[PDB]
Write an enzyme that holds these catalytic residues in place. Structure first.
Site, PDB file in Angstrom:
ATOM      1  CG  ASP A  71     -13.772  68.079  31.167  1.00 47.34           C
ATOM      2  OD1 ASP A  71     -13.622  68.530  32.316  1.00 47.34           O
ATOM      3  OD2 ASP A  71     -14.662  67.254  30.841  1.00 47.34           O
ATOM      4  CB  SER A 116     -10.786  73.082  50.039  1.00 44.77           C
ATOM      5  OG  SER A 116     -10.842  74.397  50.562  1.00 44.77           O
TER       6      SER A 116
END
Ligand SMILES: NC1=NCc2ccccc21
Length: 330
Positions: free
Chosen positions: A35, A199
């Site tokens: 994770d 992004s």
């Protein structure tokens, strides 16, 4: 040193991935959910409330000659889906795909919430976010990666998750045969303890690319792709019959649909998520309404590039002095 381990979807929907991990001496192999959105290595154990264990493999520290109670240490964690676990802490030897760390904090669960109990395939979590998020008190502990880092050939790990297939976590090296083209690196903020990056935009299907900054985290422990409501609405508007369902808890679509791809930007590079990756199947057994793999982050407070996005790429988690992320197509 290096390590390399195969990671395997837990079910036919890629709801999560498990990777075998050796703990203790003699080794006890548990299948952990790696994770990158948390920083605790915790396991089902001989200390876990019996009614809360249902098929998981447990760590029994009393059977490990290298286990030592970390005196006075406790831990307690909550995750984004409302699940939680807590307990006490041992140090022990932990190996992943041939890479060994001695003195790793192994957090033994005394309590786990129902979602963990109900998932027989996940024996615990192995956190790979920054150690500043580790919940052990009163002395915060380091992640497996941080402990390993100085010994690694290169201070990196990579995630290569499969779509409905196994994949790989590598530590300490970049497998140049595992991706196509080049890896594009992008800046990371560690201010919130996550692999947080920006992004450069998105496209829906064969549509034009929209240049827009989207700040989010690379999180292998989250199943889906959570993006701003504007972006998600633009995606689902291209699917006939798709709608946001308050009763189901997100966007659903007719199971008869063919889903468009979704592209996200990494600098000037582009990662394309095929439409099929966005199908999470019937909302309930036998239903013709299917659950979408791209959902709104509104109310979460952060955008999350979860498995839906990451499994479309070869992803480098670069833990150099100034961390960065790398993405390649594959
Ligand atoms: N990183 C995580 N996102 C959702 C979640 C649930 C359970 C464990 C870890 C995570």
């Amino acid at each position: 040193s290096t390590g390399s381990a195969t990671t395997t979807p837990i079910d036919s929907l890629d709801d999560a991935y498990i990777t075998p991990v050796q703990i203790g001496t003699p080794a006890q192999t548990l299948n952990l959910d790696f994770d990158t959105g948390s920083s605790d290595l915790w396991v089902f154990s001989s200390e876990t409330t019996a009614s809360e264990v249902d098929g998981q493999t447990i760590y029994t520290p009393s059977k490990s000659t290298t286990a030592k109670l970390l005196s006075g240490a406790t831990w307690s964690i909550s995750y984004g889906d409302g699940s939680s676990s807590s307990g006490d802490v041992y140090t022990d030897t932990v190996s992943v795909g041939g890479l060994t760390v001695t003195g790793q904090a192994v957090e033994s669960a005394k309590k786990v919430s129902s979602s963990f109990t109900e998932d027989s395939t996940i024996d615990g979590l192995l956190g790979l976010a920054f150690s500043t998020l580790n919940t052990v008190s009163p002395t915060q502990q380091k992640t497996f990666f941080d402990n390993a880092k100085a010994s690694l050939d290169s201070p990196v790990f990579t995630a290569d998750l499969g779509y409905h297939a196994p994949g790989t976590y590598n530590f300490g090296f970049i497998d140049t045969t595992a991706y196509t083209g080049s890896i594009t690196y992008t800046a990371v903020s560690t201010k919130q303890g996550f692999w947080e990056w920006t992004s450069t935009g998105y496209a829906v299907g064969s549509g034009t690319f929209k240049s827009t900054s989207i700040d989010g985290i690379a999180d292998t422990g989250t199943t889906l792709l959570y993006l701003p409501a504007t972006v998600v609405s633009a995606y689902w508007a291209q699917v006939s019959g798709a709608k946001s369902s308050s009763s189901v808890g997100g966007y659903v679509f007719p199971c008869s649909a063919t889903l468009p791809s979704f592209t996200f930007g990494v600098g000037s590079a582009r990662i394309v998520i095929p439409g099929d990756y966005i199908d999470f199947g019937p909302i309930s057994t036998g239903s013709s309404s299917c659950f979408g793999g791209i959902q709104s982050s509104a109310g979460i407070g952060i955008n999350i590039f979860g498995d839906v996005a990451l499994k479309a790429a070869f992803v480098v988690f670069n833990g150099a002095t100034t961390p960065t992320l790398g993405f390649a197509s594959k």
